[PDB]
Design an enzyme around this catalytic site. Structure first.
Site, PDB file in Angstrom:
ATOM      1  N   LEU A  43      37.282  41.793  44.800  1.00  0.00           N
ATOM      2  CA  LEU A  43      37.503  42.648  45.616  1.00  0.00           C
ATOM      3  C   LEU A  43      37.820  43.872  45.558  1.00  0.00           C
ATOM      4  CD1 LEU A  43      39.217  40.023  47.128  1.00  0.00           C
ATOM      5  CD2 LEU A  43      36.925  40.791  47.548  1.00  0.00           C
ATOM      6  N   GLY A  44      38.813  44.877  43.993  1.00  0.00           N
ATOM      7  CA  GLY A  44      38.657  45.719  43.909  1.00  0.00           C
ATOM      8  C   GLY A  44      39.895  45.836  42.840  1.00  0.00           C
ATOM      9  N   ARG A  45      39.744  47.328  42.597  1.00  0.00           N
ATOM     10  CA  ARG A  45      41.028  47.562  41.385  1.00  0.00           C
ATOM     11  C   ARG A  45      41.996  49.153  42.151  1.00  0.00           C
ATOM     12  NH1 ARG A  45      38.046  50.466  37.057  1.00  0.00           N
ATOM     13  NH2 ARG A  45      37.771  48.133  36.069  1.00  0.00           N
ATOM     14  N   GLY A  46      42.863  48.101  41.853  1.00  0.00           N
ATOM     15  CA  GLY A  46      44.317  49.343  42.634  1.00  0.00           C
ATOM     16  C   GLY A  46      44.907  49.489  41.871  1.00  0.00           C
ATOM     17  N   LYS A  47      45.776  50.664  42.147  1.00  0.00           N
ATOM     18  CA  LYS A  47      46.864  51.057  40.393  1.00  0.00           C
ATOM     19  C   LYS A  47      47.449  50.164  39.304  1.00  0.00           C
ATOM     20  CE  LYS A  47      50.584  54.601  40.033  1.00  0.00           C
ATOM     21  NZ  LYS A  47      50.058  55.119  39.294  1.00  0.00           N
ATOM     22  N   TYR A  48      47.794  48.546  39.882  1.00  0.00           N
ATOM     23  CA  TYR A  48      48.153  48.285  39.214  1.00  0.00           C
ATOM     24  C   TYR A  48      47.909  46.729  38.778  1.00  0.00           C
ATOM     25  CZ  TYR A  48      52.689  51.139  40.060  1.00  0.00           C
ATOM     26  OH  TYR A  48      53.097  51.888  40.161  1.00  0.00           O
ATOM     27  N   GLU A  50      43.563  44.414  39.798  1.00  0.00           N
ATOM     28  CA  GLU A  50      42.123  44.022  39.087  1.00  0.00           C
ATOM     29  C   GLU A  50      42.493  42.786  40.528  1.00  0.00           C
ATOM     30  OE1 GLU A  50      38.695  43.748  36.513  1.00  0.00           O
ATOM     31  OE2 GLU A  50      38.938  46.098  36.926  1.00  0.00           O
ATOM     32  N   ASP A 154      57.424  49.684  49.608  1.00  0.00           N
ATOM     33  CA  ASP A 154      55.707  50.035  50.218  1.00  0.00           C
ATOM     34  C   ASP A 154      54.565  49.181  51.109  1.00  0.00           C
ATOM     35  OD1 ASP A 154      53.225  51.015  49.049  1.00  0.00           O
ATOM     36  OD2 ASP A 154      52.586  49.151  47.972  1.00  0.00           O
TER      37      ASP A 154
END
Length: 328
Positions: A43-48, A50, A154
């Site tokens: 679905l995605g790769r964020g800062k911390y 996958e 956050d």
């Protein structure tokens, strides 16, 4: 140096819990069986991490798998301890398992799946009733985690997953969350830019649960005024200027004066002098159906420079704004 500060609520919850509860650095992780989960789509790769949709083959249920990027064992154990401490709380995402990914050679956190819609489109269609309803559901999660001695740090639309069919909400992405200890100095590099409280933007480290209430106020303003994001800074410095153009510079000085904090001298060229605006300034014929005197008073009471003056989560659930929301 800076005048100390303490949360006005749940101040000592951790000091009276056993050490096991907050000493996440000693936490021993229990690992599940990674063969239980088959990855279906990324679905995605964020800062911390996958992020994947997956299937738990032991029950055929959909789940979400976050395979963590290399990070300090400390920060992994903090997020894992926090998730275990909060599991089963109102509207808190459920950690279903923790497994070792054989490829990344890092922990993979497995979470209950929520049938979300993109907040960008979702916020375009929320009625006034729906905004109140969902704000109340977010406050349930925040009061719970604050009552359990934890700040989220956050809060933003991307971390609120909503299944609109079933009117179900979960607060997710606890990897920046921390245990509140009175007098502890925290890192100010948390939260995402448009939702950062003034305390972060002025480098005041002794902040508390009230940081989440500023972020929630930013989400509220964005929803009721249909202005995404509401404080739209180009960077962390301009972020404070954008806030000052609404709340005014005299109360920003009063805030920093109260805590004997000095602005970065770089503000001397960019900050200017601004009056506090009345909230009516942001109402127009395209959002007026979302605005009421109760919404504006509630927002006014969240968006205070002084973190000590903001409504707590419990106080916010007492506000007239929520009188129309049907309780269960």
């Amino acid at each position: 140096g800076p005048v100390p500060s303490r949360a006005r609520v749940y101040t000592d919850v951790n000091t009276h819990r056993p050490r096991e509860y907050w000493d996440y650095e000693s936490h021993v992780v229990e690992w599940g069986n990674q063969d239980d989960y088959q990855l279906v789509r990324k679905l995605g790769r964020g800062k911390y991490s996958e992020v994947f949709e997956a299937i738990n083959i032991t029950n055929n249920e959909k789940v979400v798998v976050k395979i963590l990027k290399p990070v300090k064992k400390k920060k992994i154990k903090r997020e894992i301890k926090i998730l275990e401490n909060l599991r089963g709380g109102p509207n808190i995402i459920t950690l279903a398992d923790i497994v070792k990914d054989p490829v990344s050679r890092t922990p993979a956190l497995v979470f209950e799946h929520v049938n979300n819609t993109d907040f960008k489109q979702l916020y375009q269609t929320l009625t006034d009733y729906d905004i109140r309803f969902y704000m109340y559901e977010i406050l349930k999660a925040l009061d719970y985690c604050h009552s359990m001695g934890i700040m989220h740090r956050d809060v933003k639309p991307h971390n609120v997953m909503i299944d609109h069919e079933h009117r179900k909400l979960r607060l997710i992405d606890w990897g920046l969350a921390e245990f509140y200890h009175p007098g502890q100095e925290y890192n100010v590099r948390v939260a995402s830019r448009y939702f950062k409280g003034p305390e972060l933007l002025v480098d005041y480290q002794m902040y508390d649960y009230s940081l989440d209430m500023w972020s929630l106020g930013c989400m509220l303003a964005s929803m009721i005024f249909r202005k995404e994001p509401f404080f739209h800074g180009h960077d962390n410095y301009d972020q404070l200027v954008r806030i000052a153009k609404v709340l005014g510079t005299e109360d920003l000085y009063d805030y920093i004066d109260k805590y004997n904090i000095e602005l970065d001298p770089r503000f001397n060229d960019i900050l200017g002098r601004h009056s506090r605006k009345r909230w009516e300034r942001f109402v127009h014929s395209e959002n007026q159906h979302l605005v009421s005197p109760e919404a504006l008073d509630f927002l006014d009471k969240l968006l205070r420079y002084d973190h000590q003056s903001r409504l707590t989560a419990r106080e916010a659930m007492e506000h007239p704004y929520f009188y129309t929301v049907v309780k269960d």
